[PDB]
Amino acid sequence: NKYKRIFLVVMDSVGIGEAPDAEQFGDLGSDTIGHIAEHMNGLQMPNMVKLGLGNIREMKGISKVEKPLGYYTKMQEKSTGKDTMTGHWEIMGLYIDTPFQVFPEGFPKELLDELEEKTGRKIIGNKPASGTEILDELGQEQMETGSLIVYTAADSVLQIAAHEEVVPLDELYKICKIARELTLDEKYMVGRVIARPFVGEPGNFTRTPNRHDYALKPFGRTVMNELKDSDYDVIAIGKISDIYDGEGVTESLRTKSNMDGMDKLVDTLNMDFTGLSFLNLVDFDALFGHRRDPQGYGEALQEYDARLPEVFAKLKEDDLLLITADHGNDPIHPGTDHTREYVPLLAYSPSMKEGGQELPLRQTFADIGATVAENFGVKMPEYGTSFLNEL
Numbered sequence: 001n002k003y004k005r006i007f008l009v010v011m012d013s014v015g016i017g018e019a020p021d022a023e024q025f026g027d028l029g030s031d032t033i034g035h036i037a038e039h040m041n042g043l044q045m046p047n048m049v050k051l052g053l054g055n056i057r058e059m060k061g062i063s064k065v066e067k068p069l070g071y072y073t074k075m076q077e078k079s080t081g082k083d084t085m086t087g088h089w090e091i092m093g094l095y096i097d098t099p100f101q102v103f104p105e106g107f108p109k110e111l112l113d114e115l116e117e118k119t120g121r122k123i124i125g126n127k128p129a130s131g132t133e134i135l136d137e138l139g140q141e142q143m144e145t146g147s148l149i150v151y152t153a154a155d156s157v158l159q160i161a162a163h164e165e166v167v168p169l170d171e172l173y174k175i176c177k178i179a180r181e182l183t184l185d186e187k188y189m190v191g192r193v194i195a196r197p198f199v200g201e202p203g204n205f206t207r208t209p210n211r212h213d214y215a216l217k218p219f220g221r222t223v224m225n226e227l228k229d230s231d232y233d234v235i236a237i238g239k240i241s242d243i244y245d246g247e248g249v250t251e252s253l254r255t256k257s258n259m260d261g262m263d264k265l266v267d268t269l270n271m272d273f274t275g276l277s278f279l280n281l282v283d284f285d286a287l288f289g290h291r292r293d294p295q296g297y298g299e300a301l302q303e304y305d306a307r308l309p310e311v312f313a314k315l316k317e318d319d320l321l322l323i324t325a326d327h328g329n330d331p332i333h334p335g336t337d338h339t340r341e342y343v344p345l346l347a348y349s350p351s352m353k354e355g356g357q358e359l360p361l362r363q364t365f366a367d368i369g370a371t372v373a374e375n376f377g378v379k380m381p382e383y384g385t386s387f388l389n390e391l
């Protein structure tokens with residue numbers, strides 16, 4: 001192999017400007033990093049800059065350099081949707097025609113009617129909400145009626161909450177599996193169904209660790225499947241294992257924040273493995289993008305950038321670092337949904353002794369998967385063009 005270990009970092013939702021098909025999505029004018037840079041009166045990301053971020057696009061406080069550490073370009077999304085699952089599935093070599101849906105005004109009556117009809121239970125709520133808000137509002141009614149609290153969020157999720165002393169946990173999991181089957185339907189395609197059992201009394205409800213997620217498997221065998229099947233290490237950090245429903249994952253490392261995600265990246269740099277270490281930094285999307293909080297988003301990006309020099313110091317000659325994103329989520333955009341954007345691509349190895357150059361624009365995110373596959377000599381994915389030879 002040209003590289004013994006590839007470290008792939010997805011900065012979740014960190015877009016680099018509206019994509020060519022942004023109009024279809026109502027995303028004209030969107031620009032995640034650019035709007036954040038403007039809000040911050042200049043972003044301080046000196047390490048991403050040294051890698052060549054500004055060489056991709058100059059933005060406030062983000063300038064090009066004469067000799068970037070590695071290679072740089074951006075990527076265009078080919079799949080129909082702009083959600084996290086679509087983006088990650090494309091990265092690992094797939095093409096996804098059918099988008100996952102988001103539900104800002106709740107779920108269609110048709111879907112909820114069929115769920116009631118199958119479960120023998122009434123449904124209440126049906127709106128985007130955090131776990132705490134919805135329980136305060138509807139927990140007592142749930143307890144008294146044996147109802148199900150069905151709710152959503154800014155991402156493609158259907159969440160079902162029930163008190164553990166009113167609806168048995170095993171019954172809640174059965175209900176969620178029914179909902180998982182019903183939501184495999186393009187009219188109401190949700191990324192994930194989530195059991196949200198809770199306990200306590202009115203004015204003091206607590207969600208329990210008995211939460212269970214019901215994810216869909218990627219629509220195809222990914223490069224991660226192929227890596228795993230050829231006995232390579234595939235170390236998933238953060239939401240990565242969940243995003244792929246465990247497909248192709250050999251070890252999974254849970255994280256609780258972006259700084260924790262960088263600590264686990266460092267842990268994998270200290271492991272003797274051959275194959276892929278794959279980090280998702282999710283705070284960008286989950287805490288700041290959807291909440292339309294450009295200040296918190298800007299601070300998070302600066303906090304992330306300050307961690308990078310330790311990553312640089314630990315990379316070996318036969319290590320490759322890849323930094324990218326899976327869509328945009330512009331924190332100064334209308335509504336609460338993602339935005340259809342190009343995503344940056346930075347490719348760095350210490351063996352690049354004369355620095356890098358511009359790569360041709362990646363026409364699908366799957367060029368990442370093709371590059372990984374070619375590096376490790378596994379079956380090339382159906383989609384994507386490797387840039388391994390350009391490095």
Ligand SMILES: O=P(O)(O)OC[C@@H]1CC[C@@H](O)O1
Nearest residue numbers: 129130131132153154155157
């Ligand atoms: O605890 P919360 O605010 O209800 O977060 C729920 C998450 C947010 C998006 C989806 O992952 O579900």
Ligand SMILES: [Mn+2]
Nearest residue numbers: 025026027333
């Ligand atoms: Mn929009």
Ligand SMILES: [Mn+2]
Nearest residue numbers: 012013084326
């Ligand atoms: Mn995402």
Ligand SMILES: [Mn+2]
Nearest residue numbers: 084155285286
């Ligand atoms: Mn999101």
